[PDB]
Design a protein around this ligand. Structure first.
Ligand SMILES: [Zn+2]
Ligand SMILES: [Zn+2]
Ligand SMILES: [Zn+2]
Ligand SMILES: [Zn+2]
Lengths: 58, 58
């Protein structure tokens, strides 16, 4: 799916939720960051967001 | 791009090259890891690979 950020649905999925050595890409960097600041869990696995990487394709 | 890992072209781009708080997604986790172990640079920006995240799209 080339579908947008699942939260805002207005921006691309370029906000990578890192937990250790695995990452989940369902949200934009800006949305995924708000989740971490407001102490929400990863929507994919409900595991704490350790950090957020701004991800660029090619 | 729905195109495969630029190195092996046999696995998806699920190997996120992290440098600071930005990541580059052009290679598979296994290919991007070999780059880090053999002290190669990020093919996108020729900046050192600080870590590699195994990324899952949802
Ligand atoms: Zn968003
Ligand atoms: Zn997760
Ligand atoms: Zn590869
Ligand atoms: Zn790079």
């Amino acid at each position: 799916c080339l579908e947008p950020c699942v939260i805002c649905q207005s921006r691309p999925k370029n906000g990578c939720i890192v937990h250790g050595r695995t990452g989940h890409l369902m949200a934009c960097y800006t949305c995924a960051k708000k989740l971490k600041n407001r102490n929400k869990l990863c929507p994919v696995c409900r595991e704490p967001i350790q950090s957020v990487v701004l991800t660029y394709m090619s």
